[PDB]
Symmetry: C2
Subunit: 257 residues, 2 copies
């Protein structure tokens, strides 16, 4: 089963969450997918001081819980501080390490001491080869006999790596498709199609197809019922219909190989 | 006075700290410098689980305060997480935000709520023009009326920017000297001459380069005996090397 992780960037309100959850119900019941609903409870890196923060840990997890109960969804959320990990793992089936935190030992350790799947996003200037060390800190926490990380051992131990692009000059993101293959020696690989589109002066579908042709274990996409009215920078996100098409195309590609 | 911030990467032991402190006395007493001694109480991004962590906030701060007392040095240290800032600032004269955290709003706000000077390292893939937003968050915290960040305003309220290079492909780092000028419009600029790509000498040359462009200070990792440094024993300067580098900067700055 290919993994699909999908939902809005940040939790905005219970009704917005219910709305997007509802639009994703057909994807979630697709027996070819292993589905996880996502939303951040905090926006730690917001553009400016008065920018929307999100509801915070306690109210945000209550909300993700309600989605899990009403829709039957497994949940992914991300964690920025060690001491969030334990309580978040009681609602989230996956805990995500943000890309900028991907070398933070204590965070990785704490998250790995929980029972959740650990999804480590690759830093924007990290060499994909160096992501083995982050996988290994997690694996060693879960099984202190492991000396080197492998796909099969990371899979049995619930540790995954996520491609979100590399910085390319100032204000540009490029996806080196080679990294998908390289990181897959170490762990299952998820492709974040909506992070990685950014050029100065949508590409998400075409990169998702490229990624599926190379070989990925799953897809991650930020999705909103109405991007123009989102409380993020609304530029990165797909509509549900757009995501359905993208997923349709990935499965056809994957079924060739 | 130009700022010099110098000390080891991490607190190894009290005697090691005392030893590096002693060797920095000549630079600490230099009439042309505004000197701060630094060292991290925690190394948050070590490449292995077994690797040395540093002594932790409590004990590390206690060690730095001892240096402050014994040597009369003002202190810089870095903060990595919530609820460190206020306690760190009882000892540290400068609180530093590491480069990968340079856009973390809550961390900026929290550090800026203390009495400390705030040193914001530029992210390895940040456009220097975008550092103006980090400065403004810190500035607004200290004075709500400020709408746009400026050198004069950042200097008065103790918010500095620090250049540490930009990622250039994989496993390589490049200093865009233009960033020194660009960032200086927003705040005083320190150049981190020991900036190096971590791997999971050109320092004097870049320092002279940066002094010629225009900087408000220099930051350098320094160790008495780098080969026996608990981390990272590859990129630090020896005390005498730092002196040479400081000499050349002052001469270049004296032309202007």
């Amino acid at each position: 089963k290919s993994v699909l992780i999908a939902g809005p960037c940040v939790i905005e309100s219970l009704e917005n969450l219910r709305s997007i959850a509802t639009k994703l119900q057909p994807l979630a019941n697709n027996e070819r997918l292993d589905f996880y609903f996502k939303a951040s409870f905090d926006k730690a890196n917001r553009t400016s001081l008065e920018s929307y923060r999100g509801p915070g840990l306690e109210k945000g997890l209550e909300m993700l819980q309600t989605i899990k109960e009403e829709f039957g969804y497994k949940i992914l959320t991300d964690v920025h501080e060690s001491y969030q990990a334990s309580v978040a793992a009681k609602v989230a089936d996956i805990l995500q390490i943000p890309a900028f935190l991907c070398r933070q030992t204590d965070l990785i350790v704490e998250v790995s001491q929980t029972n959740a799947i650990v999804n480590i996003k690759k830093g924007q200037f990290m060499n994909p080869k160096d992501m083995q060390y982050s996988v290994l800190k997690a694996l060693k926490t879960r099984d202190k006999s492991i000396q080197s990380p492998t796909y099969e051992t990371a899979l049995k131990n619930g540790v995954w790596l996520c491609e979100r692009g590399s910085s390319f000059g100032y204000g540009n993101l490029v996806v080196d498709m080679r990294s998908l293959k390289i990181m897959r020696e170490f762990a299952p690989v998820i492709f974040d199609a909506t992070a990685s589109v950014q050029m100065p002066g949508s590409f998400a579908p075409i990169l998702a197809r490229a990624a599926a042709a190379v070989g990925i274990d799953g897809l991650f996409a930020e999705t909103h019922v109405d991007p123009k009215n989102a409380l993020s920078d609304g530029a990165n996100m797909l509509k549900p219909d757009e995501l359905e098409q993208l997923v349709t195309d990935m499965l056809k590609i994957q079924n060739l190989f």
